[PDB]
Structure 1
Amino acid sequence: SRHSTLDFMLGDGETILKGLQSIFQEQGMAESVHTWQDHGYLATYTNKNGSFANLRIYPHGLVLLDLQSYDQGKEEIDSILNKVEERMKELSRVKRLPPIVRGGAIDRYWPTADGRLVEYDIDEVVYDEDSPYQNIKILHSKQFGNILILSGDVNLAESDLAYTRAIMGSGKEDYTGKDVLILGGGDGGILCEIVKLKPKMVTMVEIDQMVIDGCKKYMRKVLDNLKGDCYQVLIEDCIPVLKRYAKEGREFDYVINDLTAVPISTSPSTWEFLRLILDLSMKVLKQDGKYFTQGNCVNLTEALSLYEEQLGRLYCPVEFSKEIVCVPSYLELWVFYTVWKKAKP
């Protein structure tokens, strides 16, 4: 469960192999050696306590060491690593990344949307449950506070006021006396920030009661009650609700799409589904209102282009703008869209 690495960038393979072996030999470890017709050497060392090491010596001045614990055993590995560093100076760039914990009861590793390995300062699993719709985790970060992670995707931390600010239009909008629809938003951030501004009505449409309840319990920076003088939370799929509102001719001043990156469907195309949501949102948006949503990470330039393609395929002509926002817990810069109807004639 703890995997430690040490990389040396140099450049004699055999001299290093022989020069390092007593470090392991003196720890009581068993050693086997694989040799290639110069693809170098692989040395494998086994310990009685269930830990092992691998020393890989490439033909051109690259030596990689891996130690894996069964994880006293941590100090033994750290000590070996320190010795190997000492010895390599005698035998003479070095990289010693933080060890990775493998199969930890607390999972600290939440790769970014663009596929980068990032480790978070998680000291506690606060909540980890499966609803009928998604896995819901809330993990405590020392710096970011509690972080909501839905199907393995970081959605929001208690530190992420910048997300909620950006998706409400970055302080440019007056919500006083306005009618607002929020799609998703199970954490309650947007809802609660808007209630503070004295709207006429905010309606939030969230499919998963378990996200509502977990965030009520654990994402605490109003909602003891799901209906108030100027808000209501509907626990349902936003699609039939969008349709029902269009059918009653209802129009909002603002529609804020705070759904998961992959909106939840109960039907047994990716882009088509986003377009549908868009189209349905435009149908309940006043001619002079605005629609806001989170876009995607700034580096996913193809996915942002295919998204903006869909903005051209709506029942009405629209215009849009975008802004790049730094959300603390995201560990990647994010794009946020503002969308509005083109003036009619």
Structure 2
Amino acid sequence: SRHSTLDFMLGETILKGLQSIFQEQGMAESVHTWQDHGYLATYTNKNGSFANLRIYPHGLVLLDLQSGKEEIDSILNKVEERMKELSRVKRLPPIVRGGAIDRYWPTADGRLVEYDIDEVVYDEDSPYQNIKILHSKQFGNILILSGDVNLAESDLAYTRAIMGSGKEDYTGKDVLILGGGDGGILCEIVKLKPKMVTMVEIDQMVIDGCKKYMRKTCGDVLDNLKGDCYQVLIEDCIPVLKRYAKEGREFDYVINDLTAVPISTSSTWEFLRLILDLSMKVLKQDGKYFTQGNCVNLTEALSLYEEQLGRLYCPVEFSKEIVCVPSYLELWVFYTVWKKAK
């Protein structure tokens, strides 16, 4: 479950130099020789540890160890000293495999990143989604929904951007929030004296988790679903969006803070187009819609998202901004959408 690696990039001899080290440790060897692809040598230890040593023909040498800790540290050290005599080196941090505390959460653009996580605070499946809250030293508690990092206690920048980056005056305004169960936006918007904020969150268990564990993002705003100038509704935002349109209710601001794949109990792109149509129908002619776009590098996904903006019952314009959100480890795009003036 501890997997160590060692890479050598150079310009049979290497095998003969390295083999020695493994015999010296009492490990048993078996070599597979390839016609013009070099060698694979496997090394098994009594204690149930093993090493793989791949030697490609063009001077690429890769070594793996799997697992007492110091033994292997020292063995990799022996491999470096020996390779110095025999003559680029890469010795990445070992990867824990099957740890009780899971540190690896790839970015939306498919990059491998290890987080500074020391404690599983919350891990529960809800009717809709897996919900984890993992503690980071630097990032505080982090909310992770269906394996996608949503927000850490450090990510005020996300909230700032989806709120229009300080350009908007929320004083006495009517606001709708879709999703947003971390309480981030609701917490910050309520300090600003809106007339009324409505947040529609389908998953009570996300709120439960966040109220207890992300208080540095939501403060106390999530303790009562109903407050001075705000209400939290536990339902699917789709039907709520329809009700509001049907009664012809409109808002100054609509803020879509759903997960990347919204939750449905009723293709993914049609769904996004649907929410936009509904949000527009309840958005004041002179109002604004804000939402999270995607990471900067998912250009095809950003491009398909903007096709949906062109597919709505009404013409709209939009602006984009790139924002650095601390726990994301990839820059993120946020959208501002508005109705085209008649």
TM-score, normalised with respect to structure 1: 0.97
1:198-209 aligned at under 5 Å gives the runs 198-209=193-204
Q: Deviations over 1:219-275 (max 9, x none)?
A: 0113211101100000000000000000111000000000000000012x1111000
Taking the aligned partners of 2:320 and 2:198, their CA distance within structure 1 comes to 25
Q: What SS does the aligned partner of 1:330 have? A: coil
Corresponding residue SS for 1:172 = coil
In 1, Cα distance between equivalents of 2:308 and 2:61 = 50
- Verify the 8 A CA contact 2:4 2:93 in the aligned structure 1: yes
Q: Distance in 1 between matches of 2:62 and 2:255?
A: 50
SS in 1 for 2:215: coil
Partner Cα separation in structure 1 for residue 309 and residue 56 of structure 2: 52
- Mapped partners of 1:220, 1:32: distance in 2: 56
Say how many residue pairs are matched.
Answer: 338
Q: Distance in 1 between matches of 2:227 and 2:247?
A: 22
Cα distance in 2 for residues equivalent to 1:77 and 1:175: 59
1:16 CA displacement: 1.1
User: Conserved in 1, the CA contact under 8 Å of 2:207 and 2:222?
Assistant: no
Q: CA deviation at 1:313?
A: 1.1
Between the aligned partners of 2:177 and 2:75, the Cα distance in structure 1 is 55
Instruction: Report the Cα distance in structure 2 between the residues aligned to 1:14 and 1:270, rounded to whole angstroms.
Output: 53
What whole-Å deviation, never above 9, does each CA across 1:11-50 have from its counterpart, x for those lacking one? xx91111111121111111111110112101000000111
Check whether the contact 2:201–2:233 (CA below 8 A) recurs between aligned residues.
yes
Q: Distance in 2 between matches of 1:47 and 1:263?
A: 49
State the alpha-carbon separation in 1 of the partners of residues 330 and 24 from structure 2. Answer: 45
Aligned counterparts of 1:201 and 1:150: Cα–Cα separation in 2: 28
How far apart are the structure 2 equivalents of 1:306 and 1:93? Answer: 41
Quote the offset at 1:158 in angstroms.
0.4
Distance 1:171 1:314 in 2: 28
Cα deviation for residue 153 of structure 1 reads 0.1
Output the CA distance in 2 between the equivalents of 1:194 and 1:42.
60
Partner of 1:252: 251
Asked if structure 1 preserves the Cα contact closer than 8 Å seen for 2:53 and 2:63, the reply is yes
Q: Which residue of 2 aligns with 1:179?
A: 174
Which stretches in structure 1 are left out of the alignment for 5+ residues?
none
Instruction: Give per-residue Cα distances to partners, 1:129-187, cap 9 Å, x unaligned.
Output: 10000000000111111110000000001000000000000000000000100000010
Tell me if structure 1 keeps the 8 A contact 2:4–2:94: yes
Does 2:14 match 1:9? no
In 1, the alpha carbon distance for the partners of 2:224 and 2:270 equals: 35
Q: Distance in 2 between matches of 1:236 and 1:156?
A: 21
Report the aligned-residue RMSD. 0.9
Look up the match of 1:51: 49
Q: Aligned partners of 2:57, 2:66: CA distance in 1, in Å?
A: 24
- 2: distance between equivalents of 1:279 and 1:150? 25
SS at match of 2:100: coil
Specify the SS of the correspondent of 2:13: helix
Further displaced range: 130-139 or 221-230: 221-230
Q: Distance in 1 between matches of 2:198 and 2:324?
A: 27
The question of whether the paired residues in 1 share the 8 Å contact of 2:181 and 2:206 is answered with yes
Alignment match of 1:141 (pick from 136, 145, 151): 136
Secondary structure of 1:328's aligned partner: coil
What SS does the corresponding residue of 2:36 show, helix, strand or coil?
A: coil
- SS of 2:240's equivalent in the other structure is helix
**CA displacement, residues 279-328 of structure 1 (integer Å, 9 cap, x when unaligned):** 00000001111000000011111111111111011111111001000001
Report if the CA contact (8 A) 2:103-2:114 is conserved: yes
Runs in 1 of length 4+ with deviation above 6 angstroms? none
